[PDB]
């Protein structure tokens, strides 16, 4: 409740608060990755619309985080949003466990509820836990500057370990050990982390946060039709501030498509996994445990790049960031189409052995995505961070969240459109890959993103001209 | 965050806050009444070892309630007490549910925590939910007073339904269905209410509060030792009022021996239940489920009195209630030893029969405790409300909780005393009570309560002669 006391508002906060961060982030992977294998095997839904289902939860998961961020900053507290939404997911992620214990009519209503309740909690929690660990920070930071970025960096390459573990350990517990423990532990994980965080309310110092920027971006959007009827600095320097974001839009819209190549990764590649050359010597590998190559492919890249960035910046005379304003964004797109087409070539390189009459076959597509991801993500971030003012910086992260969600919603559209393409005989979005076609769909995304790549470079020459001529 | 809002601070306060009170209430009985049965044949403890582990829990469950009430009245609010101590209990009971599904040296280590975690949680929740949901009260009260008092009697005889069902179905879900669901439903029940509570942190209005007597009493004790070496209005008003709290004390001290008798019904009388004439036709009744006769006893003795109050107030010229101040306690203390006399007499009629070669036999004792309770409570409560200056009105519901907690401990002291002096060839409370002499343990209680109630009568004369002169 009162004014700062350095003998209370300290690491105690950094500890308990960020417990939920690992707890939530690891649950989103744990649940997310393998939800496909449940909706298929356990839930009986058709492969085409068993994937479709998942994207929309993921799509929500982010659109909710975008929607919930505003609620956080503008309404009743960035603290309370953690408390309200950790309690929302704990309820949602426990109905999922009870959903794996009680008994597709009523069974779906409960499932889609439990999922879009976990899509709700995650959206609110993720939007604040990160910014509440931050609320510790100081003016010129006396010792805080070193105390902060030592723990936070010791916390980041700590959740990387856990993120590998959610794909590795938790998928084994879901596929082999039964989804009762699989989802059940996630339920326990969040209830524990809720008391831990709420035990800390005391050792915390709540900071006065300003809810923006959209707050003004919408009054700009309302004055659209009062001006239609008409058809000092709020227009002199603020409308010319909103008209600067609409410029990110072409480049921003282009990104969405990478997140669909990243979506197809968890959906069908996991369903392709539940067939391909299974037995690993003595034991067996879980189908969904394939995403390890993407998590690895993600890790390794930024582990190498943030050691070789100097070697890029020295050979080619450049600014602090070793050729990544949007350069790294184009590179990701290049790999975006690579992974899809490789996955399409391999798709039939498995079929040309199934019809006429595996573990390594699905390794490229995942590995190519991870590399393409670490390149497109640290590109996207360090784009409108550097290409927007400080009262709009990190209100630029709002463009990242809409980018993601849109790509997952678009995969559902992409799969749904192809369902409305071929009805009779065998379509290219089947229930059985050993019977029906699928490589065709993997080529469609490989082309839709190859088209996008040429579409991107057109906007590349146009946006560089917007910051230099004007 | 700013001020009074009749169009905002509303009935969700009533709706969404009190459910935790309701959940906790069904969670304390549902676990409290059983537990002994779980520690008998599931955890495998001795009849005198398991029933003693219960009295410490339930005592500490109020010793905390006394403390949590002080936390709400002085530290980081009445909303935060609910927010912290519900999640704690939801952590605690989920550990207890996980205690009944995972694999005694390290099994009790996990079970005792999950217990005393439900105790710390339960305590803080009880001592702040009721006091926060009632936040609807207004100065002169504009149409509020009506909705206010009605909602609570649409809640108090709502939680009276479910408390009766907690002895009925929840016990049957444990004793028959399995302690997995038993504590499992108990756990989900609290994780749902905690989500609902925090969510409606809008249609809630919080008030600024301070809460004694505890503060001033200790501050008076501070002066007693700092002025020990010596052996203005605070000396004339603050102490002359503190002296008034030293007055309930002998009455308070006597009531302690009622909760010792009460505790036996929840613990030791559940061992006299399980071993006696089980089945009722085609379907059997759970051993713990005998408390329906106690719960029914209370609920009836209450409803019967709440009609035959005016009938005996008009016969014997009384003021607002039918000889309800300290005359009220007396009956409960006599009925306290009465059930200890009756149950002992029926014990030998259960034992002397078994050596010579049941469900009806335990109905008397449960009712006698229930009857005496609704009398001792409307005595203890309707005492210090009218028997202490209004600055400490209801700031003596502690002088209620302290009588309970100690009453539970005094029984834990009683069982440990009898075991050391009478053990181990022919013990009173042993591993097998048929191969032991139980009946005489009651004569220690029955006569103790007969002697304790005797000193109560010896005090009642010296009270309305030494306190009435003020």
From Swiss-Prot, chains A, B:
PROSITE patterns: PTR2_1, PTR2_2
Keyword annotations from UniProtKB, A to Z: Auxin signaling pathway, Herbicide resistance, Membrane, Nitrate assimilation, Phosphoprotein, Symport, Transmembrane, Transmembrane helix, Transport
Role of this protein: Dual affinity nitrate transporter. Involved in proton-dependent nitrate uptake and in the regulation of the nitrate transporter NRT2.1. Also acts as a nitrate sensor that trigger a specific signaling pathway stimulating lateral root growth and seed germination. The uptake activity is not required for sensor function. Displays an auxin transport facilitation inhibited by high nitrate concentration. Required to prevent auxin accumulation in preemerged lateral root primordia and young lateral roots when external nitrate concentration is low or null.
Bilayer-crossing regions: 26-46, 57-77, 82-102, 105-125, 155-175, 181-201, 248-268, 280-300, 329-349, 358-377, 398-418, 439-459
Further information: When mutated confers resistance to the herbicide chlorate.
Keyword tRNA-binding: no
Expression triggers: By nitrate and auxin.
Deletion consequences: Altered development of nascent organs. Reduced stomatal opening and reduced transpiration rates in the light resulting in enhanced drought tolerance. Slower translocation of nitrate to the leaves.
UniProt GO molecular function: nitrate transmembrane transporter activity; symporter activity
Protein name: Protein NRT1/ PTR FAMILY 6.3
Processing after translation: Acts as a high-affinity nitrate transporter when phosphorylated and as a low-affinity transporter when dephosphorylated. Forms homodimer when unphosphorylated and monomer when phosphorylated. Low nitrogen concentration in the medium stimulates phosphorylation. Phosphorylation also regulates the nitrate signaling.
UniProt effect for mutating residue 373 to A: 80% reduction of the transporter activity
Phenotype upon changing residue 24 to A: Loss of the transporter activity
Topology in the lipid bilayer: Multi-pass membrane protein
Sequence similarity: Belongs to the major facilitator superfamily. Proton-dependent oligopeptide transporter (POT/PTR) (TC 2.A.17) family.
Subcellular location: Membrane
UniProt organism field: Arabidopsis thaliana
Gene Ontology biological-process entries: auxin-activated signaling pathway; basipetal auxin transport; lateral root development; nitrate assimilation; nitrate transmembrane transport; oligopeptide transport; photoperiodism, flowering; response to herbicide
Variant or mutagenesis effect after changing residue 389 to L: In chl1-9; loss of high- and low-affinity nitrate transport, but no effect on nitrate sensing
Gene Ontology CC: one annotated term: plasma membrane
Entry-linked Pfam families: PTR2
Subunit structure: Monomer and homodimer. The dimer has the 2 monomers in the same orientation. Interacts with CIPK23.
Tissue distribution of the protein: Expressed in the stele in lateral root primordia before emergence and in the tip of primary and emerged lateral roots. Detected in emerging and immature leaves, guard cells, flower buds, style, stigma, anthers and pollen grains. Not detected in the shoot apical meristem.
Chain sites annotated for binding substrate: 262, 266
